[PDB]
Amino acid sequence: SGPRALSRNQPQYPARAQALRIEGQVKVKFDVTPDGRVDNVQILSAKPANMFEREVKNAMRRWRYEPGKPGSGIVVNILFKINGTTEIQ
């Protein structure tokens, strides 16, 4: 319910973390405006902090939500799997 997601684009896997064979599970919360624009994006928790946070924020800046609907307190979970794949809850 609320703002519907058009472009839930997956953040990019880190070339440093892949070489460390790390998997990043990030829990991020964001808000969207009445135009459906993602803002107030904060990574609440992650496997390695700044290792994945950086690429998450990059993705969140491109997330597109249907205009006409603002959202407040939207938390999702991004699963960066060791194979270099990405999924958002």
Three-class SS of the chain:
CCCCEEECCCCCCCHHHHCCCCCEEEEEEEEECCCCEEEEEEEEECCCHHHHHHHHHHHHCCCEECCCCCEEEEEEEEEEECCCEEEEC
Q: Does domain 1-89 match CATH 3.30.2420.10?
A: yes
Nearest to 1 by CA among 69, 57, 85: 69
Q: How was this structure determined?
A: NMR
- How many angstroms separate the CA atoms of 16 and 48, rounded? 11
